[PDB]
UniProtKB/Swiss-Prot annotation, chain A:
<feature type="binding site">
    <location>
        <position position="295"/>
    </location>
    <ligand>
        <name>Ca(2+) 5</name>
    </ligand>
</feature>
<dbReference type="GO" id="GO:0005737">
    <property type="term" value="C:cytoplasm"/>
</dbReference>
<dbReference type="GO" id="GO:0006338">
    <property type="term" value="P:chromatin remodeling"/>
</dbReference>
<dbReference type="InterPro" id="IPR013530">
    <property type="entry name" value="PAD_C"/>
</dbReference>
<dbReference type="InterPro" id="IPR004303">
    <property type="entry name" value="PAD"/>
</dbReference>
<keyword id="KW-0479">Metal-binding</keyword>
<keyword id="KW-0963">Cytoplasm</keyword>
<dbReference type="Pfam" id="PF08526">
    <property type="entry name" value="PAD_N"/>
</dbReference>
<dbReference type="GO" id="GO:0042802">
    <property type="term" value="F:identical protein binding"/>
</dbReference>
<dbReference type="GO" id="GO:0006334">
    <property type="term" value="P:nucleosome assembly"/>
</dbReference>
<dbReference type="InterPro" id="IPR013733">
    <property type="entry name" value="Prot_Arg_deaminase_cen_dom"/>
</dbReference>
<dbReference type="InterPro" id="IPR036556">
    <property type="entry name" value="PAD_central_sf"/>
</dbReference>
<dbReference type="Pfam" id="PF08527">
    <property type="entry name" value="PAD_M"/>
</dbReference>
<keyword id="KW-0164">Citrullination</keyword>
<feature type="binding site">
    <location>
        <position position="141"/>
    </location>
    <ligand>
        <name>Ca(2+) 1</name>
    </ligand>
</feature>
<keyword id="KW-0156">Chromatin regulator</keyword>
<keyword id="KW-0805">Transcription regulation</keyword>
Length: 559, 568
């Protein structure tokens, strides 16, 4: 700020430690003036920012700061002298006064005011309080704001400290003083602080109320202001202001390759056959299987002090379900490394009167969480319309680190022809049809060509939207047959959707052809999956799999 | 698209140029094959990624493309000679075919296929059809995209081409297929283009319907899809897809420092003397004064086709809340700074400044948020909030304004500073002639013997100092570029500030010629003292001032700096 002084009478000024208070000596100068000498207190930082006896430049900023907060009203005073050849120097007095006002927060991102990203960047992280709540848990889920002012005892008789936020971001932040006392929030964008003289520390804890959205660009700001108030008839004037940086935590979705922590079940009560295999699997996996004690997708928000998990659930189309919403492993797309995955979702290739796609609200919601940029897919030609019915990710403890199982009906034809060319071509599937009875259906060949053509489009679109390669995709046999409105469906029960319970998993049984008392599809999928290092269990086939939240924190990427 | 070859029979396909033709080699491989070979001419651009014994690698990439276009089916032949150790070499066949597909437009931000800002960006700007506006006339002002298809004639009997926009973007693009023409717009998301085979060129004219706003970042995309319908019962299969991207041109405001092209007037009063002075002043400025025969800001949406002037209001181009609004969000509040440099970020197109309070409060006033989010969507001009609620008018131009100056950085900011008025009054009374009458008439010694005025007046100087530091940090200004205009302020009910005598800074500027309202000040030596100072400080630089007893909107030239060359 600027203060201007009149030589005929003393006046009162205030400088805050840390800011360079500008002083102009020329505009309000005495009538005749050409040379200046500074004889000031040793404790005052009086610098010059733009002894060579430089003349009175129009704009010559003299920066002023003082360190030691006083005890009385304006102990320190400053005087200037101006020596010329016309008369002895004239005098000006300034009643200066030091104070210290500091607002420190989670500056190190370890646990400061306007939202900001950055792996090496300044800004605290806010956990979204989508629930309405003490003690340690409050100390550990809200960010830390600490207020420290060193002042003269009677200094705040004529001064005031005010704490405020911008009016566009007022709705989605809230701060408590330390039941909890509301300082700011959706209703109060500003407040005045009651700080007595000397030292008084009042601490604040910060929370949000919403996730990044379309109408929420990505700032929440804080600014501290100092008011000069010496006269009771004039409006309040400002002397000091600081404005700095903190950011909100988004929502996240969890893939099927993380080491699980807790898995669940449903209520169909076929568990005695269903949950027997999965229960023995969890005993093999040493995972804690609390079945459902008695559609729902599991994510987590994180801060430097907490990683509280959350769950979400849901003019309705068949492509809007979360089964059409599948998250890739930690990925790297064209240099942009998404350690939190790229959400993958299916819609049509061109819209028409009959095309289907997601609600734009949901796509924008996943877009606004710029940690996971979504990807458009093509799963409209399929009758149900989900991506999980033809794509899946399974853990890979070697090579690249994750395996994409993709349905491919053309390897099924290869195997069926191969085992028919071995003499025993009368294997019974499931009515029951021979291998010849299926290889002698020309309609199936054309249906298969059409379905594989639709598959390849999605395939290419994953290889470009996930940074994939030919070595990272493995094909599983699955024949397809069309239906009403010429929509595709699987021939035998789907084998690409399955329960990943670790490095060993559960796949539904094919109930297919029997080869010397064994199912050929089963031995093939085991010869294609197990050598990588997995173990597969086969069962007649509702399950939600909570996993360990990522070691990577969302604030360490550059979106 | 992926192409798969089965050893039982060869497969025919159409390979559109622009996609590296990928070949699948593992899913449908022969039962005894472990290696295979290729046969083609040296001129063929064959792309292989690991004769020569190429085995069945899990990640061997095979992409093929051609150096010509085919209007005749299978003008080139490519046999893939799989070779087996104990099996005679089986040969997968593929009669190559390429159609010439061209989606040509103004795609260097000059209206991956993406949009990037900067002087060397990619994209196409479209201008808003804010008018209520045959085929020969609109070809110059509109954006025309050229779709060139060179395909065999028999294609479009079992193939269809489809143009479309997303199911969120229809109401923001209208395309005309070169009166009434609905291709894809407010009601139609897609169009089945009836394209005769052979070689054919197609033109579309594109106009918007909305400016960048809160919900619209500004980018739109248009995609053409090439399908396949060989069978009449099964669904269509996509063969190729191409895309282009546009951005809506955003409205740009106009500062008070740009050369004039058309000055406008309003016959609110008779003001014959004012009118004669204005026409004399405009003839001195050599501008075409268009009197209206019986606020509104005249900007421009600059595009690489035309720079249509834009009328923004609360002819040219004309671009709401039910009620209960406050008067201080009017358009006199929004003033455009010249190009500046703020904390490193440099703004060639200006920094919009407006009226608000320094800290939000219950009695504080601020602009309607709609304009703030609007001009924020205009990422070209990042706004700045200032401390100008301490007046009862709340307009930033009531105490500061930018005048042209051929010296240094080309602009000078007049700030209404109380304290120079008192300084000059002190000097004039010190020299002796301190009893001249002002204007209700009051004396020079009387005001200098008024201390209440010195306190209201010093408080206003404190507010001016705060806003001065704000401009030094939010406009990157300096202390030497601020002329302290002598001007006194007073307070009224609710402690709001007002001008005492007519404000010399709320002046209608029409170039270098300052139409300053008359101060009606003390008379000494023949002239007015405030007039004396303003003539003794501006004239040594070269300005010319005329003092009228004061509704003049001035359309001005564009900055000639293309908006698509800067990074928000």
């Amino acid at each position: 700020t600027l203060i201007r002084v009149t030589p005929e009478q003393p006046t009162h000024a205030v400088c805050v430690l840390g800011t360079l208070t500008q002083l102009d000596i020329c505009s309000s100068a005495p009538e005749d003036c050409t040379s200046f000498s500074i004889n000031a207190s040793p404790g005052v930082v009086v610098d010059i920012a733009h002894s060579s006896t430089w003349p009175l430049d129009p704009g010559v900023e003299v920066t002023l700061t003082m360190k030691v907060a006083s005890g009385s009203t304006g102990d320190q005073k400053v005087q200037i002298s101006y020596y010329g050849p016309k008369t002895p120097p004239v005098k000006a007095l300034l009643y200066l006064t030091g104070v210290e006002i500091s607002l420190c927060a989670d500056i190190t991102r370890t646990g400061q005011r306007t939202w900001t990203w950055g792996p090496c960047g300044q800004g605290a992280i806010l956990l979204v309080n989508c629930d309405r709540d003490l003690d340690s848990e409050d100390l550990q889920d809200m960010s830390l704001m600490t207020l420290s002012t060193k002042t003269p005892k009677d200094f705040f008789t004529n001064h005031t400290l005010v704490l405020h936020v911008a009016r566009s971001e007022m709705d989605k932040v809230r701060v408590f003083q330390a039941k909890c006392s509301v300082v700011l929030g959706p209703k109060w964008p500003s407040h005045y602080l009651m700080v007595p003289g000397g030292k008084h520390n009042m601490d604040f804890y910060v929370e949000a109320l919403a996730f990044p959205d379309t109408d929420f660009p990505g700032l929440i700001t804080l600014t501290i202001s100092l008011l000069d108030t010496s006269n009771l008839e004039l409006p309040e004037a400002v002397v000091f202001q600081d404005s700095v940086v903190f950011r909100v935590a988004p929502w996240i979705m969890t893939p099927n390759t993380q080491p699980p922590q807790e898995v669940y079940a449903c209520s169909i009560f076929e568990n005695e056959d269903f949950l027997k295999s999965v229960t023995t699997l969890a005993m093999k996996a040493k995972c804690k299987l609390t079945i459902c004690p008695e559609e729902m997708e599991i994510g987590y928000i994180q801060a430097p002090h907490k990683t509280l998990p959350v769950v979400f659930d849901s003019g309705i189309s068949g492509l809007d379900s979360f089964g059409n919403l599948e998250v890739s492993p930690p990925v790297t797309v064209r240099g942009k490394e998404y350690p939190l995955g790229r959400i993958l979702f299916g819609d049509s290739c061109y819209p028409s009167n009959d095309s289907r796609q997601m609600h734009q609200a949901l796509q924008d919601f996943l877009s606004a969480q710029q940690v996971q940029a979504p990807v458009k897919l093509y799963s409209d030609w399929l009758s149900v319309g989900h991506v999980d019915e033809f794509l899946s990710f399974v853990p890979a403890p070697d090579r690249k680190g994750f395996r994409l199982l993709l349905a491919s009906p053309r390897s099924c034809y290869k195997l069926f022809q191969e085992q028919q060319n071995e003499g025993h071509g009368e294997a019974l599937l499931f009515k029951q049809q021979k291998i010849k009875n299926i290889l002698s259906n020309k309609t199936l060949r054309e249906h298969n060509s059409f379905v594989e053509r639709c598959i390849d489009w999605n395939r290419e679109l994953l290889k470009r939207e996930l940074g994939l390669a030919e070595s990272d995709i493995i094909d599983i046999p699955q024949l397809f047959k069309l239906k009403e409105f010429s929509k595709a469906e699987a021939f035998f029960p789907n084998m690409v959707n399955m329960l990943v319970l670790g490095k060993h998993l559960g796949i539904p049984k094919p109930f297919g052809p029997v080869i010397n008392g064994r199912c050929c599809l089963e031995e093939k999928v085991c010869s294609l999956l197990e050598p990588l290092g997995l173990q597969c269990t086969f069962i007649n086939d509702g399950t939600n799999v909570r996993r360990k939240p990522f070691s990577f924190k969302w604030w360490n990427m550059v979106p």
